[PDB]
Amino acid sequence: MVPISPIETVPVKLKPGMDGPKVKQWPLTEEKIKALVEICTEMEKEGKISKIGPENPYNTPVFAIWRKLVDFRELNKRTQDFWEVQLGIPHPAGLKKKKSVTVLDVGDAYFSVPLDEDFRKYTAFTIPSINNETPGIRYQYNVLPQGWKGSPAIFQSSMTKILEPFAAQNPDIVICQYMDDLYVGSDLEIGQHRTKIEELRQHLLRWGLTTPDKKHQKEPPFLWMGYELHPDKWTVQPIVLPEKDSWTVNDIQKLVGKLNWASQIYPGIKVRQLSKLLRGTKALTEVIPLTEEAELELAENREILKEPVHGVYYDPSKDLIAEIQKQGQGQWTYQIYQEPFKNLKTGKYARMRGAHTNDVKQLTEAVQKITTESIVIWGKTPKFKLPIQKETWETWWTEYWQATWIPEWEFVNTPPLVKLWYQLEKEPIVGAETFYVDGAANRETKLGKAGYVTNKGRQKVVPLTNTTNQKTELQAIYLALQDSGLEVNIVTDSQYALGIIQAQPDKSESELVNQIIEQLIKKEKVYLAWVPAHKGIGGNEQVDKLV
Amino acid sequence: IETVPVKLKPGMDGPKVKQWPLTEEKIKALVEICTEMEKEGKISKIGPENPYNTPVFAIKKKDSTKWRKLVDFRELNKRTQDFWGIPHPAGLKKKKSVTVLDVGDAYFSVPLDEDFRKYTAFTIPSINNETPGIRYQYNVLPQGWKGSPAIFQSSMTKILEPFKKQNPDIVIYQYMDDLYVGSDLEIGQHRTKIEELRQHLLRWYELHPDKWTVQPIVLPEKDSWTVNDIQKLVGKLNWASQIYPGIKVRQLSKLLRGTKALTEVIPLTEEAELELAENREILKEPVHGVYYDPSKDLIAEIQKQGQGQWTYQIYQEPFKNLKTGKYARMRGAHTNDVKQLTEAVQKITTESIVIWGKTPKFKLPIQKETWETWWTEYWQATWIPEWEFVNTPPLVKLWYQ
C-alpha cells in the first residue's frame, strides 16, 4: 500500500467558560434505528467514526431521514469562532478567459480530513437501541462532521495547504478554490490541459482526495450560484417573476431581490417604485396595491427581461471602462465594459435617504460604488464616462465647501446631462435691490408671518396658518425671490435656510424648498447674506413679522 | 531577546476587523513584502483556528518608490491594555527645529509574546475572491502597535543614553514608530547631527515648531465701510463674543439702522470707531481660562477655504481652542481635494503629536464614502488617527478666513 500523506490537524477549542454539549437522545422508530445501525457500522468500517466507552459524558442528537443527520446546533453554539474567508464569491465578469477549463468536485470532502483528537470527544452521539432495553450504541467522530461549524474553514485551509506547491510548480495554469470545488483554467492546448488536470488529481490523490475519475461530471455550460458560465461568455440563470393579483410584503422582497440579481447583466433595471412599498416592514402578511408608476416600471422590467443578454470575460490587456447614465428619481444605471457594446457587467445605484440632494453628489456616490466594486472584481479602478461637462464638475468641486474627488474620467454627451442649476454670488451685487427678509411663527397657535422690506421701499408681509419658524424663514426668502428682479441681494438671519441653500440642492422633499430652487434657477444673480438676529440690525425687521 | 507577557483589557476579545479591497499592485506589493518577512521569521502563516483580523494595506513614503506595508492597528490599539508613564516633553514644541526619524525596523529584533501573537492576525486579500486570503500573524513587535514602543522603551533608552549624555540641549521624544529630535542648531549642523544620530542607531523631514504659533482673530481695517462690510463685521464680532467676554456690537449695529443697499458706503460714527477699537484690544488678548486636560480627547476641525487653502482648530471644549492654524501648502495636489485634506490631517496630527503626545479626533468636511474610498492612496504616516464626518456646511468658515 502506498502511504497517503498525513493531513496535520487543526487545534480546536470550545468557547471560554463553556463545556461540551449534553443533549438527550430522541426516541426513534425501530426501522430508523436499524438504518442508523447499518450506516454507522459502514462508517466505522471506513474509519470515519469509532465506538467509545461509557466514560464520555457528552452527547449529540441523531436523526434518520436512509440517511443519518446529526444535529450539531448546540455544539455549534459551544464551538469557537473560525475565520471564514467565504465572504463574497467569485464574480463571472472578473474571470479571465482561458482556452481550456476544468471543474473538479472533491468527493467525501469533510470525511477526508482528520479532526483534532482532543476535540473528538465533544462530537459524541448515541444510537437508541431496540425498545431501549440495552445501552445505546456510543460513537464519536474521527473526521470533520457534516454540519459542524469548523468543517468548512478547516477543510478549506487544508485544501489550500495541499494545493500550494502544485500551483507554485505550475504558473502556466490558474486554480480557483471554492468550497468542495476547484476550477482550473489555462491557455494551453487541450491535451496539455487534460494532462495537467490528471497530474493535479494525482497530486490530490497523494493526500487521499478523490476527484471525478470519469469524464468530469460537469461540462459547459456551468450552472453555478444563479449564473450561467459559457466558454466565451457569461449570463444569469433565467428569471422567474411571479404574477399574482394579491401581493404580500415577502413577495415584494423576493421580487426586488430577483430584479436586483437580474440588474448585474441586464441594463436599465429599476426597483424604486416597488421598494417604496417596503415601508412598514416586518409584517410579511399584507396586501399592497400597485401604482401606475410601479406597474409601468415592472412592465418595463419584463420588457428588458424579454430577450437574453450575455456578459463577456475580462481581458487584462485592454482598458476597463465604466459608463454612467441618469435615469431619474434618484436612479442611476451603469455599464462596465472594455470593447463597445460588449459589457463585462452592468449595475445600478439609488440615492440615499435624504431631505435634500443634487445630481452631482449622487453621481459622485455612484462613482464611489462602481470604483469599490471594480476594485473587488478586477483589482483596479475603471476609466469613467460621465454625463457631466468638465467645466461643470470644475465649478462644482472648486466652489463646494466639502472636499470631493472623481478618478480619471471623460465627458460623454448622452442626456440628461448632470448640471449645476444655480450659482450664488460671492460678493454683493451692485445695482441690485436689497431684500431684508424675516419670518416668525407662534409655537402654540402655529400662526406665523413671513416677508421682506427693501432699500427701494418695497415691502410685504404675508400671514400664514399652520407653520413653524423654519417654514416662515424659508417662506420669506421665497417671497423675496418671487417679487425681485433677475438680480437680487437677500439678507436673512436664518442659519437654517442658509444651511439648506449652502448645501446646494437641486431637488428636495419640502415643496417650499423646491419652489425656492425653481426661483433660483430663473435668476441671473443671487447674493445671499447672513446677519445675527435680534442685534438691532436695521432693515432686519423681526418686529414686522411678530405682530 | 526575552519576551514580556502582554494581555488585553478585561472583558475584551481580540480585534475582528474586515479587510477592505485592495488594488492589484498593492496586493502584489504586500505579497512580496510578507513573503520576505516570512523568510525572516518576522511573520508566520496561521490556520483557521485564528478568528481575529486587522486590516492591512500598502503605501509609499516620501522620496521612495519602494512599497511599504501599513497595518491599521487602531482597533487592536484600543483593545490593547494600557501600558505604563513618561511625561510628555513640553519643550519639544518650544525647540527651534525638530526632525522625525523612522525607527520601525528596530522593532523587528524584539520577539513578541507568544500568547498574544494570535491578536495581530492580518489577511492579504485576493482579487475577485478567487482564492482564500493569505493569513499571517506577527512573531516580533509589529509596527503600528502601541505596545511596541512601550516594550522597546528600555532598549531605546539604553541605545540613546550616550547621545543624550552627550547633548543635554537636544530633546528626544518617541511616538509609535517615529523618533522626534528637537534642538536649536543650524540646518546644516542639524542635518549632520541627524546623520550622526542615524548612524548611531545604525551600528546598534525638516519641521520648525518656532515658525508655527497660535492665530488671533483679526478685524478689517478700512477707510470706507459698506453695509455688507459692517454686516459681516457684526456677524464675526457676534461669533467671537462666544469666545471673548467683552465684545459688544450695539454701536456698529446702530449704523445699519434703515433698509440700505448692501453696496452703499456708510461712514462710521465716533462711538462705532470706539467700539471697534475696544473689540480689537479685546481680541489682542489671549483667551480666558484655556487649559489642556490629558484625560480628555483632542478634537480637530478642518475647513476647506478653497484655492488649496485649509484652516483648522484643535480644542477640547468648544470655543476653547488649544491650537489654530492654516495649511496652504501646495504639493502636487492642485487638482485633488482629497489628497490635500489627507496631507492636512497628517500635518495636523503630527503637530498634535509634537505638542501633546497624542492624536486628535478629526471632523472632516467630506462625505464618508469619498474619504473611505480614497484616503489610503495619499497616506504616508505610520500612525492613523480617528475621524468622523460633518455633513452640514458650518457658517464659521469665513470667520477663520
Ligand SMILES: Cc1c(Oc2ccccc2OCCn2ccc(=O)[nH]c2=O)cc(Cl)c2ccc(C#N)cc12
Ligand atoms: C469553470 C469555472 C471557472 O473557470 C476558470 C478557472 C480558473 C481560471 C479561469 C477560469 O475561467 C475564465 C472564464 N471562463 C469561464 C468558464 C469557461 O468555460 N471558460 C472561461 O474561459 C471559474 C469559476 Cl470562478 C467557476 C465557478 C463555478 C463553476 C461551476 N460550476 C465553474 C467555474
